[PDB]
Amino acid sequence: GRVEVRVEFEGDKMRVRLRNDSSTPVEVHIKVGDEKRTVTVNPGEEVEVTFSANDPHKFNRPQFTIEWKKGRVEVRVEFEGDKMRVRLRNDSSTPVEVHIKVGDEKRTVTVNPGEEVEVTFSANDPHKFNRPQFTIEWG
Ligand SMILES: [Tb+3]
Ligand SMILES: [Tb+3]
Ligand SMILES: [Tb+3]
């Protein structure tokens, strides 16, 4: 299994592309401020989710929840100063590799059931954090 989540912050828009390269349908929840969007991604399927905000600063702390039907992986991104914090919580019965890609930086962490992992990324240039992407891998 693999669920690919790509984010682009092109403008007043957060685009999220979700690919389910696994054999079970996943439900994906995204929260940014007052707006929550929710989508089923069937096996093989790609879905685009787009938030708008006049003030693009309201996209500071987006949360992603992948549900398999229990089984949830929660991913919170906190853009604070020159740093991007990524907090991964695994609430399933099985470990998950999370591969993270922010500009040049590539980073892989295992997350066992009931573990929370925080990875911090640095930027010389806050435009490094404009197209962050993460993949959750299971079995
Ligand atoms: Tb684009
Ligand atoms: Tb539902
Ligand atoms: Tb469920």
Author numbering: 1 to 69, 83 to 152
What did the paper state?
Here, we devise geometrical principles for de novo designing single-chain immunoglobulin dimers, as a tunable two-domain architecture that optimizes biophysical properties through more favorable dimer interfaces. Here, we devise principles for de novo designing single-chain Ig dimers with interfaces diverging from Fvs, as a two-domain Ig architecture that is hard to find in nature and optimizes folding stability. We envisioned that de novo single-chain Ig dimers could be designed through two-layer edge-to-edge dimeric interfaces, resulting in extended Ig β-sandwiches. Key to such robustness is the two-layer edge-to-edge strand pairing at the interface between Ig domains, which involves a high number of backbone-backbone hydrogen bonds and protects oligomerization-prone β-sheet edges from solvent; overall favoring monomeric stability and solubility.
We computationally grafted an EF-hand calcium-binding motif (DKDGDGYISAAE; PDB 1NKF35) in the β-hairpin bridge of scIg12 (loop connecting both domains) by designing N- and C-terminal linkers (short and structured) to integrate the motif into the scaffold. Among the three most rigid designs identified by MD, we selected scIg12 + EF3a (loop sequence KDDKDGDGYISAAEK) for experimental characterization as it was the design with AlphaFold2 predictions of highest confidence (pLDDT > 90 for the five models and across all residue positions) and most similar to the design (Cα-RMSD < 1 Å). We also noted by MD that the structural rigidity of the binding motif increased in the presence of calcium and that the interactions of the four EF-hand binding residues (D71, D75, and E82 through their acidic sidechain and Y77 through the backbone oxygen atom) remained nearly constant throughout the simulation. We ordered a synthetic gene encoding for the design, and was found to be well-expressed in E. coli, soluble, and monomeric by SEC-MALS. Terbium-binding titrations were monitored at 544 nm with scIg12 + EF3a at 10 μM final concentration, and showed a hyperbolic increase in luminescence that was fitted to a 1:1 binding model, which gave an estimated Kd of 5.1 μM. Calcium was found to compete with terbium for the same binding site, but with much lower affinity (Kd = 1.3 mM)—this is expected given the lower charge density of calcium compared to terbium and hence weaker electrostatic interactions with the EF-hand motif. Lastly, we succeeded in solving the crystal structure of scIg12 + EF3a in a complex with terbium at 2.8 Å resolution by molecular replacement using the design model. The structure of the scaffold was found nearly identical to the design model (Cα-RMSD of 1.2 Å) and the parent scIg12 crystal structure (Cα-RMSD of 0.7 Å), which underscores the robustness of the extended β-sandwich scaffold to a 15-residue loop insertion.
